[model samples]
Target: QPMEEEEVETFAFQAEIAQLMSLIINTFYSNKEIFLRELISNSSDALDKIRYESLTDPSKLDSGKELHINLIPNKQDRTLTIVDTGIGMTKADLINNLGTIAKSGTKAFMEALQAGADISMIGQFGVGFYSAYLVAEKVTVITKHNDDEQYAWESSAGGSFTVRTDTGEPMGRGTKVILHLKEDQTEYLEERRIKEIVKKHSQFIGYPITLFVEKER
Candidate 1:
């Protein structure tokens, strides 16, 4: 066993990025209508990860047999939950990928994009996950992977973050991003807008995109 020791790490961002991040989190995504588009795009990428793995192994096919994305909104609770039953992540993967903006292959990402890499690759900013903070006061990620235990990640922007073992039933093999909408952002609670945005941005998604819509017709 190892003794507990405090570890601290700090870094700085470019002046341009420092201001751009603030502007984006505070104003860029002010339109709640775009949330669906971003979420759907993320889901499609998750599906693509599994699809690529499936090509090599038959078992991977069963693991990803049912890939989909769903949005559940709760007006009473003033929250919205986006769930995807696709390729989930492990604990180490969560910390390395989601807990920080510093990604491992950022050099490659930047270099490739500079060399006119495909748009698919460019869309994957290590910070794309932070887009949740635009409209959600709190975010939770529930994920399960075939090779690891299911876990949940909870965070309130850059203030603090926590990861705990998940007791809930497994979501087969995928991830879920739950968005607790801000009080002023009520537009995301409507299902009509979600559907429209999903189709407009993610119609080409490899998997079926589903959202809980109110039957007001």
Candidate 2:
């Protein structure tokens, strides 16, 4: 039998969270390709942590899954999924990192937006994860930490998010980000389009990146 689970908790978005979402959605209007780059960078950082930790205590390597990144785009479902075998997060980590806006830079961003600062300066604030909303109407993350059980976090790019223990198959140790693409963002469902974006932005990333393409019948 499994152990006792953590209680589900819901939290309303901070007032600035609403403003920041609107700012990025409106400001980064030119290109949406940078979203993947930001996500890959975050995954790379997670992988670096596992690599460093494994050096001191090889037991952390017990997951037995090689470090790699996988992208799956489903035209039928109109979704794009990015999965990485890297260090994941606990319930606290999920709330602390995803429940709120940029811990340090959100206020400055609000000021800049009000002052009519260049939207291009937005990336400097370390809120790249929010870029997912550029193309997705809904975003869901399923992550598993070595020290904690699996949990799912979901949001609709609106005013709030929910978190609870996941009852599905465990992720072992890593994170999976699934983006429910907007109707206009369907181009991301094409394998060729995804490859072009990856090569253009994440070609130099140290981890192996693979995209799943259907075989010809």
Candidate 3:
């Protein structure tokens, strides 16, 4: 899509994202560890989609490859970045999935958040990606899909989000999510903490999940 054609749209919270954020902030506040679990599960789901597509359309894989997820912790920048070799999302997918509350159970989940009922019921809604807001003051997602140009999706956990085309090196076929950690969430910058989270939550995932960090000399 042309730059001129892509308008930076802003939306109010009364729609979908408001409820997603409210549940995440109010209900999941005590257990932030679930954030990693939700993210890895989402990645696994994406990898499965590509693998299934490869069966009927081998070109979707582009080249023979092993699907995996990588976690990179930047202590200096206080950012936890996760990248996955999976069925990446298109620009429209970014808007539809992240920008809007298209998943089921959103209404009931919002009710749960408000009533202080079964908190676990929130996860059933499949708004896992919003969990990033627990740790991140801002989130940036850069993704490339097989049929569409690469794009960047950004938000600060505020009510609105912005989407634009990216000019960086092609990501091949995957998604890269960067979590700009809040001041109190800096423990995620430690390599050991990342390993513990992955082992505890995502070890059973089908795809290999790796962590990269700068070891002290």
Candidate 4:
């Protein structure tokens, strides 16, 4: 039965309101390798958001601001971190945004998919967050905003996640996504692999994209 107008809550997921919750855990299986593409796109979008916002309100940025992307690999820890000097998620945004799937461009992406559009063009949906679960046993995000405290979002991808204030020094205004790669996903830890992926997926990011590769000893 459809919900009555007065009974609707702000917490409701708009697309397929009846089955949204169930879709969260299952809808992410298609093309798992595309996760990196989605993440880079999201980072670029965050950069675009701040750049545009700053246009109307100059104070949105500091005296010296450079929008860019950075990637680093830690072999000892078996981890890869993708950092962006773009808009960071606040405490509330971190909770609500990461907690919900398909909340960003759900409707449009679905429409395109249903119409046989190229799936590659359908990634604008915030469901991009789920892609981390494909290769990482755990994913952690450290974010800081101009108007709020630094926060962290950590998920082991066992179908649940945690959010908390970060104990580290606050970021000026950006996010760093750390992926604890799983055993099977070790190929992603290679410098050549990361460079190839970034160049293929995010070459058009409009800002500098830096990947700190490992040196051959």
The better-scoring model by TM-score among 1 and 4 is: 4
lDDT of 2 by residue, 1-217 (tens): 9897667677777767767877765654657777888888888888888888988988887885588889988887888999888899888899888856446777887797668775445567777787888888899999988888899999886678889999767877999999999898899888888988998878778999889975652
Q: How much is the lDDT of residue 200 in candidate 3?
A: 81
RMSD value for candidate 1: 6.9
- At residue 88, candidate 2 shows an lDDT of 92
Higher-ranked by lDDT: 1 or 2: 2
Candidate 1 per-residue lDDT over residues 1-217, each given as its tens digit: 9995533222244333333334445644334455556667777888888878887875975655877777887887787887887678987786556654455545555456446553234246544565566688788888887788888887664445677777666677888888888887777788776666666766777777667865543
lDDT at 120, model 4:
57
- On TM-score, the leading prediction is 2
- What's the TM-score of every candidate structure? 0.74, 0.88, 0.87, 0.75
Query: Which portions of model 2 show Cα errors greater than 4 Å?
Result: 1-7, 26-28, 110-122
Q: Model 4, stretches more than 4 Å misplaced?
A: 1-31, 100-124
Order of models, best lDDT first: 2, 3, 4, 1
Query: Model 3, 150-175: lDDT tens per residue?
Result: 88888875577888788666788889
- For model 3, what is the alpha-carbon lDDT of residue 32? 78
lDDT of 2 at 26: 62
- Sorted on TM-score, best first, the list reads 2, 3, 4, 1
Best by lDDT: 2
Q: What is the RMSD of candidate 3?
A: 3.5
lDDT of each: 0.67, 0.81, 0.78, 0.71
For 1-217, candidate 4 gives per-residue lDDT tens digits of 9973322112333334223223433354454556677778878888898889899987888822889888888887899888887888887787667764446566665566566654455465556655676677788889887778888787764445676667766678888999898887788878888777777776677888888877753
- Better TM-score candidate (2, 3): 2
